[PDB]
Amino acid sequence: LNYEYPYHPSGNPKHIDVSEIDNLTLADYGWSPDAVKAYMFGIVVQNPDTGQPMGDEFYNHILERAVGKAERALDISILPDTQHEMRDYHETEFNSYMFVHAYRKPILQVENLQLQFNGRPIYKYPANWWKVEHLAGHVQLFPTAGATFAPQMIRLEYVSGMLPRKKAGRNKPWEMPPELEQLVIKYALKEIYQVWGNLIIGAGIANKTLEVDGITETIGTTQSAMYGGASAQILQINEDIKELLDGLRAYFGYNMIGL
Amino acid sequence: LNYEYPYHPSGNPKHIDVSEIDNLTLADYGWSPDAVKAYMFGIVVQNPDTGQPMGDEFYNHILERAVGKAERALDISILPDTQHEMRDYHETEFNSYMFVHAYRKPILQVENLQLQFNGRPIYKYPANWWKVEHLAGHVQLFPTAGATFAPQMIRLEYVSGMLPRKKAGRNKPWEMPPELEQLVIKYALKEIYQVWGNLIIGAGIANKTLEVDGITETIGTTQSAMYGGASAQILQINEDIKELLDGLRAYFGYNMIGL
Amino acid sequence: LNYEYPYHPSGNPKHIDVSEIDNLTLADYGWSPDAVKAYMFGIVVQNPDTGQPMGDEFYNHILERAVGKAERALDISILPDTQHEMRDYHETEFNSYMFVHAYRKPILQVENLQLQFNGRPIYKYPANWWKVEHLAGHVQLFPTAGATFAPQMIRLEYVSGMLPRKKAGRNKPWEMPPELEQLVIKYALKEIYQVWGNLIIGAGIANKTLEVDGITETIGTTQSAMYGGASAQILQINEDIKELLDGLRAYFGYNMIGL
Amino acid sequence: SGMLPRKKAGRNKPWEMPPELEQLVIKYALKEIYQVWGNLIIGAGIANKTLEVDGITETIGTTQSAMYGGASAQILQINEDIKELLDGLRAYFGYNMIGL
């Protein structure tokens, strides 16, 4: 076997280069204003004072915040980032093959793992000992060869995140599931409909009738004293979000810790 | 006695030839577009853009999927197929006259039964020992003369399915009950009504009035902001389905297993 | 007996060639824009400002996400893919004929199975020992001849997925049920109805009346301040989805693990 | 197995069909025939109509509605009759039982 040092092919296979984590963008996951506009096919949002359509700056803003919302509704790291963690010694888990659970998941790869004292490395574990479970967020060692806890004894560096899926309809455990993309889209869309709902009619109008010289024109709009212009669409989007979240909260497990 | 070898007249009587399982078709069970159209007597479904009636390809598609639905709402095999199963040794059931429950039921006939090791037949049981209970899905042997389980010791081949009934108003245990036909029809019909409900009026219209020169024409349709054009028919079909399913889930028993 | 090496005819029969997993497409499973459009026979989705029909790219996008949703509502792998797993040693299950449960199911076939240490094969199990249960997702060995667990001792490679069914109305345990196709169609159709429900009528209009020179028209739409234009169809589709999911969650079993 | 048609009016031997089971089967058929007929009483999907032409005016409200089909009432009454008949017949035939 030959490999780039930390990336032992069995225990810690390389999945991404540290150059690419700066090159990946939201558009590479398909989160783009064009996608949102596709879900709003046949609708246009424009300023009634000017006819100017809504700018892509707002779409990208909403998309980035929707990504943040998805990364907090589920205890996951969506976008690749380098994580550096100082983790505590606990006797039970240290005896359990040096078990540590990462704060962020999935693990793309582990970059460093050391036992240290005041920042001095006390031991550097050979990379061929590292065992990684990517979707779980678990790291262990399987060596080839006065208190129950102590703070910040373990130094761990790794890359968390998800890669864009390689094939249609499929994902590896380190690849973003196709439906989490749609969840993020639904979160963005729920904001865009709240903006659009103000502009279907003049402000605050539920009904109008206008008549001149016996020509009569009359509108009842979807606005009402209770419900906003986009109420129904938002309710449907919330139902879809609920189904998607149930599915994804079955894919990622329940959090647990041993005291 | 004389018989075709596997089909001992008492324990495993022949009910179908293996040539016929390729010749049987949905139409032989009476599932045909004409039957659906008979239940929709006095209605026609046609494309308003062209006046073309709906093609029989769609009816046959819906019928085949409705058959699949019926085969999953009940734990049954409707259409004849050859099943090959590798079944585990369990000590209690093996001592219980070599009891095995087939995964699919009814049994039309058993084709092979052997005890084997790495695909080598260790023993071939004489066909005169085979005892079959067709509707239950049970097979047993009644010989004329370090662990509690082991995987895939038993090799079983059989035909599952149901034959079309020979007489009006009657069925043998290996014949399709007359009302399961109607259940499959009701499942197809529930889709056809959902298609038809879009075409009774122009899209999205609940009311119209049109008046020209004092001639007045006015319609209230069965569409509404809540209920679709075929709501009532679907509700009635669901009631009928519920009664039929209760009856058929009394005919086939509750599933049970001994741990 | 003669066979391609890993694919022992009894324990691990070959069901697909590894060349075909690249060639299979959504269309081979009957998921196509035309299969969606058939369920909306007599409707067209059309931009009211231009008359252009919606492009099939959106249909394909929605279908691919609907497949992802179906693969998360049920704990299954629909489309064929090659899975590589490193699985932990557990003493109880290792003693239980080397029982391992795959993370993904059904198994189409097992490609490799080895016990290893730092990537070195410690033993390679003869293919004639492999016992596979395809729909369950179980693998065992039946040999011909200091801690309770250890990480990643077992190396398992296999193909998960389902093949398109070979006969009408029937599926083998490794073949897709006909009703799961309809489930994926219904998931796509729910989104297409959400899009179309905005376009049946002028945006945000619940009632209109126009009177000009002795011509009068009044229209009430299915849109309302509470309900969107396609509310009814979506509700019925949700009922159908619920029935299908109950059936399929009876076909696949409840998940269980021994702690 | 089976039943013979009864030999006297109003009476059945234990091997003869009860008169009310005939009515039960009739009611089951009739429920389907009413489902068919309930689509045809009126133009399909019409709940209200009004027409005014040259001083002739007609308005009709039908039993069809966005909730209920045209034959809803008859089907409901037939379901009540079926329920009574089934209670009676499930008193005539007993509860099933087996010794394990």
């Binding site: 398909g30 094939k167 | 024409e217 | 790219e57 959106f58 | 133009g43």
Partner: peptide, 20 residues
């Protein structure tokens, strides 16, 4: 391969009821 990402109904009088 790659993931896909970006009538007739007539009103008429009942003439028999008109005769009545």
């Amino acid at each position: 391969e790659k993931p896909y990402m970006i009538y007739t109904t007539r009103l008429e009088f009942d003439t028999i009821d008109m005769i009545r």
